[PDB]
Design a protein around this ligand. Structure first.
Ligand SMILES: CCCO/N=C(\C)[C@@H](Cc1ccc(OCc2nc(-c3ccccc3)oc2C)cc1)C(=O)O
Lengths: 15, 269
């Protein structure tokens, strides 16, 4: 799934 | 403009000024030299690169690039600035009303394809025909020094300068750029977007505010909006070409390591 963008994802969640 | 449409302009512009350390107003003041006579340290050769690095020693060693080739050392310092800008861009995006609401998958896609378009769009602010600011406005690396590097490292920036020179001729201020960047971020045209419909709607509003802002900010440049519309396509191709070169660099350079965050961005792009 498009969550092969772990770091970017985390920036989108926490900051 | 209407209230609802105004608050959007103001909200996006504040997010811009708040999240990006460097902006065109500070950049033009440094490149003009009208507010101070202590100009940026000029990097124009290897000699001046090595000198500038003495100050960046702590960082370079921390990432173990101290002894890597000059091109790779530069390639890496550029990545760090990119990783830093992507971080600010992510916060800036979350500040655009309607972005945080999107499916997390579409949020990723939007940043994935828009980050570099915005990066090169914003990098023009610190560029002129002879070079560009680095290290938050404290340094100035020359356009010539960049073309002196060996291939392929010397084929990375020159295309950007070419773009920036035409973009900079539009004479946009930070109020125009903020809307412009938000538009490139909320693009319903991205590959693999789940809710194209809704995002397209969000893009329309922002695009609407942009069009009206440009008219009352630049009344003498009638077709400035459509001109910027073209700039958006140009940046898309520009980044496509940039992705290509970075791909070539990776499959053909031992120390051209790519930072993880950036790594995931280029993957499958
Ligand atoms: C030349 C290869 C470009 O590669 N771009 C890269 C990997 C970057 C993009 C990028 C970011 C910032 C840039 O400009 C600022 C800058 N900062 C330095 C700098 C040099 C030495 C010490 C500290 C900073 O040189 C430059 C131009 C250019 C390109 C990437 O593809 O992610």
């Amino acid at each position: 799934l498009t969550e092969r963008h772990k770091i970017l994802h985390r920036l989108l969640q926490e900051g | 403009e209407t209230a609802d449409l105004k608050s959007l302009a103001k909200r996006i512009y504040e997010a811009y000024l708040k999240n990006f350390n460097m902006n065109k107003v500070k950049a033009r003041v440094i490149l003009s030299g009208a507010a101070s006579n202590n100009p940026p340290f000029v990097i124009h050769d290897m000699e001046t690169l090595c000198m500038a690095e003495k100050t960046l020693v702590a960082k370079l060693v921390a990432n173990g690039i101290q002894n890597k080739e000059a091109e790779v050392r530069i390639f890496h310092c550029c990545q760090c600035t990119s990783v830093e800008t992507v971080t600010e861009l992510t916060e800036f995006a979350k500040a655009i009303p309607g972005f945080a609401n999107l499916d997390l998958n579409d949020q990723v896609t939007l940043l994935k394809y828009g980050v570099y378009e915005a990066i090169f769009a914003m990098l023009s602010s610190v560029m002129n025909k002879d070079g560009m600011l680095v290290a938050y406005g404290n340094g100035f690396i020359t356009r010539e020094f960049l073309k002196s590097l060996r291939k392929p490292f010397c084929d990375i920036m020159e295309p950007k300068f070419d773009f920036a020179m035409k973009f900079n001729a539009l004479e946009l201020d930070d109020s125009d750029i903020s809307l412009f960047v938000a538009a490139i971020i909320c693009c319903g045209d991205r590959p693999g977007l789940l809710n194209v419909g809704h995002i397209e709607k969000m893009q329309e509003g922002i695009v609407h505010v942009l069009r009206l802002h440009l008219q009352s900010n630049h009344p003498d440049d009638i077709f400035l909006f459509p001109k910027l519309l073209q700039k958006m396509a140009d940046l898309r191709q520009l980044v496509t070409e940039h992705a290509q070169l970075v791909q070539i660099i990776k499959k053909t350079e031992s120390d051209a390591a790519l930072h993880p965050l950036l790594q995931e961005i280029y993957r499958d792009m």
